[PDB]
Amino acid sequence: DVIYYYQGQITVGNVAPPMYFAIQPNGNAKIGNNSNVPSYINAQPSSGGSGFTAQVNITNATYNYYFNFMGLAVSKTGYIYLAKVAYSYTATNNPIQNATLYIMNQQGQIVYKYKLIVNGVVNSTLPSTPLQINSGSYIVSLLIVPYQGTLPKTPSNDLATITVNFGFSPMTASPPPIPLPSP
Amino acid sequence: DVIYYYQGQITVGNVAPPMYFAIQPNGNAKIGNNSNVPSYINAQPSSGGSGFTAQVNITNATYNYYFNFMGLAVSKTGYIYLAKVAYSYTATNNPIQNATLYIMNQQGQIVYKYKLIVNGVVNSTLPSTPLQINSGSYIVSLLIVPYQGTLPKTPSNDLATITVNFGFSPMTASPPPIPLPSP
Amino acid sequence: DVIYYYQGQITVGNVAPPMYFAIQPNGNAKIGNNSNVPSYINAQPSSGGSGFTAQVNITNATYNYYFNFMGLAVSKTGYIYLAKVAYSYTATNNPIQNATLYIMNQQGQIVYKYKLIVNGVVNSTLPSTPLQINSGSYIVSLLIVPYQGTLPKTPSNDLATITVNFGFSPMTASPPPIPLPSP
Amino acid sequence: DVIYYYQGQITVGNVAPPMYFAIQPNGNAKIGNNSNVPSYINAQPSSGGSGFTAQVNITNATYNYYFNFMGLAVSKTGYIYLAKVAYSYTATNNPIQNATLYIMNQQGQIVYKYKLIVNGVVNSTLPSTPLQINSGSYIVSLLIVPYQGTLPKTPSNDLATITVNFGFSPMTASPPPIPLPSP
Amino acid sequence: DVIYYYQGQITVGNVAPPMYFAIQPNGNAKIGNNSNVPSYINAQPSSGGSGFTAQVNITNATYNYYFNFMGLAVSKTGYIYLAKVAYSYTATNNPIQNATLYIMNQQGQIVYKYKLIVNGVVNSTLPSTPLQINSGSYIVSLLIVPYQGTLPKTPSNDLATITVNFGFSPMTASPPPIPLPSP
Ligand SMILES: *[C@@H]1O[C@H](CO)[C@@H](O[C@@H]2O[C@H](CO[C@H]3O[C@H](CO)[C@@H](O)[C@H](O)[C@@H]3O)[C@@H](O[C@H]3O[C@H](CO)[C@@H](O)[C@H](O)[C@@H]3O)[C@H](O[C@@H]3O[C@H](CS(=O)(=O)O)[C@@H](O[C@@H]4O[C@H](CO)[C@@H](O)[C@H](O)[C@H]4O)[C@H](O)[C@H]3O)[C@H]2NC(C)=O)[C@H](O)[C@H]1NC(C)=O
Ligand SMILES: *[C@@H]1O[C@H](CO)[C@@H](O[C@@H]2O[C@H](CO[C@H]3O[C@H](CO)[C@@H](O)[C@H](O)[C@@H]3O)[C@@H](O[C@H]3O[C@H](CO)[C@@H](O)[C@H](O)[C@@H]3O)[C@H](O[C@@H]3O[C@H](CS(=O)(=O)O)[C@@H](O[C@@H]4O[C@H](CO)[C@@H](O)[C@H](O)[C@H]4O)[C@H](O)[C@H]3O)[C@H]2NC(C)=O)[C@H](O)[C@H]1NC(C)=O
Ligand SMILES: *[C@@H]1O[C@H](CO)[C@@H](O[C@@H]2O[C@H](CO[C@H]3O[C@H](CO)[C@@H](O)[C@H](O)[C@@H]3O)[C@@H](O[C@H]3O[C@H](CO)[C@@H](O)[C@H](O)[C@@H]3O)[C@H](O[C@@H]3O[C@H](CS(=O)(=O)O)[C@@H](O[C@@H]4O[C@H](CO)[C@@H](O)[C@H](O)[C@H]4O)[C@H](O)[C@H]3O)[C@H]2NC(C)=O)[C@H](O)[C@H]1NC(C)=O
Ligand SMILES: *[C@@H]1O[C@H](CO)[C@@H](O[C@@H]2O[C@H](CO[C@H]3O[C@H](CO)[C@@H](O)[C@H](O)[C@@H]3O)[C@@H](O[C@H]3O[C@H](CO)[C@@H](O)[C@H](O)[C@@H]3O)[C@H](O[C@@H]3O[C@H](CS(=O)(=O)O)[C@@H](O[C@@H]4O[C@H](CO)[C@@H](O)[C@H](O)[C@H]4O)[C@H](O)[C@H]3O)[C@H]2NC(C)=O)[C@H](O)[C@H]1NC(C)=O
Ligand SMILES: *[C@@H]1O[C@H](CO)[C@@H](O[C@@H]2O[C@H](CO[C@H]3O[C@H](CO)[C@@H](O)[C@H](O)[C@@H]3O)[C@@H](O[C@H]3O[C@H](CO)[C@@H](O)[C@H](O)[C@@H]3O)[C@H](O[C@@H]3O[C@H](CS(=O)(=O)O)[C@@H](O[C@@H]4O[C@H](CO)[C@@H](O)[C@H](O)[C@H]4O)[C@H](O)[C@H]3O)[C@H]2NC(C)=O)[C@H](O)[C@H]1NC(C)=O
Ligand SMILES: *[C@@H]1O[C@H](CO)[C@@H](O[C@@H]2O[C@H](CO[C@H]3O[C@H](CO)[C@@H](O)[C@H](O)[C@@H]3O)[C@@H](O[C@H]3O[C@H](CO)[C@@H](O)[C@H](O)[C@@H]3O)[C@H](O[C@@H]3O[C@H](CS(=O)(=O)O)[C@@H](O[C@@H]4O[C@H](CO)[C@@H](O)[C@H](O)[C@H]4O)[C@H](O)[C@H]3O)[C@H]2NC(C)=O)[C@H](O)[C@H]1NC(C)=O
Ligand SMILES: *[C@@H]1O[C@H](CO)[C@@H](O[C@@H]2O[C@H](CO[C@H]3O[C@H](CO)[C@@H](O)[C@H](O)[C@@H]3O)[C@@H](O[C@H]3O[C@H](CO)[C@@H](O)[C@H](O)[C@@H]3O)[C@H](O[C@@H]3O[C@H](CS(=O)(=O)O)[C@@H](O[C@@H]4O[C@H](CO)[C@@H](O)[C@H](O)[C@H]4O)[C@H](O)[C@H]3O)[C@H]2NC(C)=O)[C@H](O)[C@H]1NC(C)=O
Ligand SMILES: *[C@H]1O[C@H](CO)[C@@H](O)[C@H](O)[C@@H]1O
Ligand SMILES: *[C@H]1O[C@H](CO)[C@@H](O)[C@H](O)[C@@H]1O
Ligand SMILES: *[C@H]1O[C@H](CO)[C@@H](O)[C@H](O)[C@@H]1O
Ligand SMILES: *[C@H]1O[C@H](CO)[C@@H](O)[C@H](O)[C@@H]1O
Ligand SMILES: *[C@H]1O[C@H](CO)[C@@H](O)[C@H](O)[C@@H]1O
């Protein structure tokens, strides 16, 4: 048998993140200041600012809104998009009608709106178009619209889970909407 | 292209509502007992107490008053405000001059007054200041002042519609007046 | 911050009035026929029958009586009461000792007597008890007792003003005496 | 509960009286000149000419006559009637058989005769028919016929009291005989 | 002593490569166009297309993805496999959790997935099964999943190195998975 071998050599270095999740980034007391309300939300930046984790309590309210629960810091200009969403629930009936995640200016204006879940199903059109985002820092906020009547009378900690991936690229020109592979 | 992906994970739990709309909450026969007068008003709490729906018949009377048409139960202390109002009418002429919604003590004293419509237009100053409301239960009542001469001689079911959103926050300290986003 | 939003939706329809003020209601030439005596009284039903407006000239007579100045039509049985009275005067001295407003049967019998002003002050006991009134039509008449010596020698158009609100409810069972709020 | 409120607004002005009681009206030295005879009669116009008050001493005479004790001035033509009479006495026996009040022309002719009391009782047919009276001024006179034997030997100031109400209307056409209500 | 000598004679010729690494192979502007993003990746084909060299900057992002950083051209059909992987790092803590290298169709579909590093260690099952690959050209892309918290705050050029050997055989029938010897 004849085998030809081709050698790839990859050297790995380390660079400061183009964007990261944080509480009060750069000491800005207006960005990400509602990470923790002692029976209703508990959110934290994932290790090294790599993402975020949130425990979120919905109720009977027709809109449940988690304003400024995280801060998004962007160190260098680039293009951002919603790359992937995954949704699952433990209940007999689907608990969420609509879930939307907002990136917002410090003055509370919406910069970008990301529909995660629509009429009870994940956004089907993903990955979304890469849109430019400027350097600075942004309020990030979550809105949930439950399906009324489906929420149990007895409280619970594990009604549903939403996993979301944002893709960011630090390029000068817009990339295609690249979908995130399985590792 | 280089894409960096950041993962948000949101776990959703369920909590008993800080406030809810109800008829005779906790069996209190004095709160919300006028939800239904068989040709003049028909009001109901929206599913799970998430809000309310009312069909309301105005007449030629210079003030039309719907006393105790709903009950508001508040399970834990918090801050309440008028977040958003929307108003529209099907007639050629605007039917309503003033519409005001009252939260009232069990003794019929006004706790808070919410002007929904003033001189024929929605309240422009919204969202209103968050004000503290104590735990307990409250009478809620609607006053409408028509524009006389505009109401048709023949009855109708769809003269106008008023949509109102109350924001409530279960925090110890007052929030900013956060406006409700579009989903 | 966590905000829970609760949505009220009010749909407004239109219904023929349970009672209204009119001149010669249903063409009845005996009800409300003294709305206009060309130097002494000029009364009219407010727009759509929503109430009434009267210009009323008092004189030196010890009783000044305005018989049948308005007609009250009641289309459906219900409970009526005097909800609120407001009184003010432009003169140096209080011009009115007693003012009383009567609802009367077609045969001139008194059905209900409403004391608006007593010994120069508004009725303090208001709102009055809701009393049943049958469908049909009623003479309405005003009696004023001036304070003699207080009326100026020179005539005037704006000596005093009396504002009165009647509450009517089309319910089968008597309501509490609900006071009219400020809008 | 549903309450409909109807607003009456009454604005009160002031007008020179269509008729009034006076002593020597317009300076006419023939009208009302016997208001005061120093042990037998003392009569005065009530404040602003609104009526009259008289202290009247009867004696053993079979007719007691108080000629021209008041003057009646009529500024504009209208219809006059005896609206109400009330009579009471402090004695054991009824002191008066007949009491009659006359409106008289300046020449002493009777224009109208008002029987107040007949055979010891008030006129039962009241209110009387409205009759036209012309502008000008009139003598007014009282006749009393006692029941002899009933008057005490010792004089007294409070044997009996007669209260009389005249209705006047300044209309061109005759009204019905409207009875004066209780305030 | 008796020595028997056996003569091997090897004549060496030269043949166009069955596959090679390239930027935009055959002028195809869609294959290998992300070899260079000026602070995040710098990749080049090794001399004569014999392999590739890449400098790759990871950050705090939970997935770091280097899409289309090289082009793989395959001139004749054959069988390809991952022959050998070697991994080392200069840091105190292991920087990489998972590293995966993808061969992809021009439409961005995954043809083959090569797990280089899994849970911080090199793939232990190597050499992998030879799988057929058709003639044409392929996108090649690298995904790295760091261990968060391990990456230093100060940037560096030499955090880790990954050396990878792909074996290719131009035979019609699949060979055994032959491991690459040390020279
Ligand atoms: C946590 O981070 C939050 C980020 O949202 C902060 O919320 C912001 O609070 C401001 C005032 O907060 C004070 O009062 C609250 C109680 O109400 C306390 O909880 C706080 O501790 C603090 O004491 C609020 O500002 C409003 O009030 C100001 C006076 O105090 C007044 O100057 C402002 O104009 C507001 O009325 C923020 O609200 C936003 O303010 C911006 C202007 S600025 O950024 O404040 O300068 C407004 O933008 C204007 O909007 C118009 C459009 O209508 C634009 O044309 C114009 O260009 C732009 O300036 C927003 O409309 C207004 O909503 C409020 N932030 C948001 C996004 O609502 C909170 O304070 C932080 N808490 C702590 C403890 O750090
Ligand atoms: C439905 O829910 C309604 C809630 O408003 C109830 O209305 C309340 O009705 C009370 C009596 O109702 C009875 O009579 C009506 C007919 O009139 C029937 O329809 C009912 O079925 C029932 O049979 C009424 O109380 C009044 O009457 C009482 C005697 O019966 C008397 O003790 C009260 O004082 C009242 O005069 C409610 O009216 C309010 O009462 C409170 C006191 S309390 O809450 O009743 O104890 C008053 O507050 C006082 O006010 C002063 C200020 O002036 C304060 O300083 C003082 O602290 C405070 O106590 C209110 O002024 C007075 O209006 C009446 N509720 C309201 C808000 O008006 C209705 O009953 C319910 N119907 C059914 C069938 O459940
Ligand atoms: C405007 O509306 C007014 C409403 O009050 C009308 O007033 C009513 O006028 C009747 C007659 O009017 C005629 O004469 C006047 C001049 O006097 C003109 O201005 C009118 O244009 C018209 O030409 C008057 O009726 C009286 O006269 C009748 C004969 O003409 C006689 O049959 C009546 O009995 C009266 O004497 C109204 O007076 C009331 O009448 C009722 C009976 S009914 O309703 O007329 O049938 C009486 O009720 C009786 O009373 C006893 C108690 O004592 C009860 O037991 C019994 O059950 C009941 O029948 C009233 O006592 C009596 O006062 C008079 N209405 C009132 C309330 O006084 C006016 O006509 C209208 N004008 C126009 C132009 O339309
Ligand atoms: C403010 O204005 C109110 C009306 O607008 C006045 O209310 C009236 O109160 C009368 C007694 O008021 C006294 O007592 C209260 C304490 O309760 C005090 O606050 C007052 O200062 C005052 O001292 C009340 O009258 C009742 O008692 C009378 C004996 O004194 C008696 O003659 C009456 O019959 C009553 O029982 C009034 O109650 C209603 O009266 C009407 C008739 S009318 O309006 O008075 O002419 C009745 O209607 C009758 O009902 C029967 C059936 O039962 C029918 O067949 C009939 O055809 C019909 O006439 C009601 O039944 C009766 O409830 C009351 N009036 C009203 C209309 O509510 C109040 O006093 C004023 N306040 C002040 C400070 O001046
Ligand atoms: C107070 O007001 C009283 C109103 O009645 C005045 O009474 C009227 O007094 C006249 C004369 O008074 C003089 O004399 C008395 C003593 O007797 C004094 O007290 C007075 O101060 C005063 O000095 C009196 O007139 C009579 O006398 C006249 C001559 O002095 C003579 O001209 C008259 O004709 C009388 O005889 C009034 O009597 C009435 O007079 C009218 C006419 S007029 O109005 O005087 O012009 C007569 O009417 C005529 O009658 C016929 C019918 O028979 C008709 O057809 C004809 O058209 C009509 O003219 C009356 O019949 C006659 O009674 C007398 N008034 C009355 C009503 O009797 C009194 O003077 C005043 N006092 C003061 C101080 O001011
Ligand atoms: C209560 O008091 C009332 C007056 O305050 C009395 O009314 C008067 O009734 C007289 C007749 O009464 C009899 O009939 C009724 C039934 O209808 C019964 O209830 C009574 O008990 C009694 O039996 C009436 O008189 C009329 O008839 C007379 C004949 O008997 C005749 O002489 C009169 O002329 C009348 O036709 C009264 O009617 C008015 O009278 C005045 C004059 S006066 O007041 O009587 O002196 C007339 O004025 C005249 O009018 C003309 C123009 O037409 C002028 O030119 C002239 O200058 C002027 O004098 C009226 O025209 C006439 O209508 C009547 N009086 C009044 C003032 O209304 C009642 O009887 C007393 N009730 C009791 C129980 O005692
Ligand atoms: C560098 O090389 C890259 C190789 O990946 C190129 O990426 C490809 O870009 C296409 C469009 O690029 C244009 O827009 C971007 C900004 O977004 C600029 O950077 C570029 O310069 C350029 O201007 C992109 O195509 C998409 O957009 C097209 C419209 O412009 C549209 O026709 C396509 O359908 C895409 O939506 C490529 O994305 C892939 O396209 C293929 C089809 S095709 O190969 O384009 O014809 C899709 O395959 C389809 O997928 C379904 C499964 O869902 C299959 O059933 C079906 O058979 C198949 O056709 C892919 O799903 C879609 O992702 C994009 N390539 C990839 C792999 O994503 C880049 O352009 C090159 N840049 C330069 C400057 O040369
Ligand atoms: C940003 O600049 C890069 C070069 O670094 C280009 O590749 C891109 O097209 C954009 O101009
Ligand atoms: C209520 O308490 C919370 C902590 O749960 C504070 O954030 C707030 O300022 C108020 O004191
Ligand atoms: C009239 O009827 C209504 C029902 O429409 C009841 O609520 C009331 O008690 C009265 O009987
Ligand atoms: C007097 O005139 C009035 C109009 O002012 C009429 O109502 C009445 O009938 C009489 O003719
Ligand atoms: C491809 O063809 C070769 C001959 O060149 C065989 O050895 C092999 O088995 C496959 O058929």
Residue numbers in the entry:
A (entry chain B), B (entry chain C), C (entry chain D), D (entry chain E), E (entry chain A): 24 to 206
Publication excerpt:
While some archaea produce only one type of filament, the archaeal model species Sulfolobus acidocaldarius generates four. These include rotary swimming propellers analogous to bacterial flagella (archaella), pili for twitching motility (Aap), adhesive fibres (threads), and filaments facilitating homologous recombination upon UV stress (UV pili). Here, we use cryo-electron microscopy to describe the structure of the S. acidocaldarius archaellum at 2.0 Å resolution, and update the structures of the thread and the Aap pilus at 2.7 Å and 2.6 Å resolution, respectively. We define distinct N-glycan patterns in the three filaments and identify a putative O-glycosylation site in the thread.
Through cryoEM and visual proteomics, we previously determined that the thread consists of multiple copies of the subunit Saci_0406, and resembles, but is not homologous to, bacterial Type-I (chaperone-usher; CU) pili. Saci_0406 consists of a β-strand rich globular c-terminus and an extended N-terminal β-strand. Like in CU pili, the N-terminal strand inserts into a downstream subunit, thereby completing a β-sheet via donor strand complementation (DSC). The subunits additionally form intermolecular isopeptide bonds, thus covalently interlinking the thread into a strong, chain-like fibre. To facilitate this analyis, we improved the resolution of the structures of the thread and Aap from the previously published resolutions of 3.5 Å15 and 3.2 Å9, to 2.7 Å and 2.6 Å, respectively. Owing to its distinct architecture, the thread is considerably thinner (40 Å) than archaella (110 Å) and Aap (80 Å). Our new 2.7 Å resolution cryoEM map of the thread reveals a putative O-glycan modification at residue T195. We were able to model a mannose molecule into the density, with α-mannose resulting in a better fit than β-mannose. The finding of the putative O-glycan is surprising, as so far, no O-glycosylation has been reported in any other experimentally solved surface structure of S. acidocaldarius. To address this question, we modelled archaella, Aap and threads through the pores of the S. acidocaldarius S-layer. This revealed that the threads are thin enough to traverse the hexagonal pores.
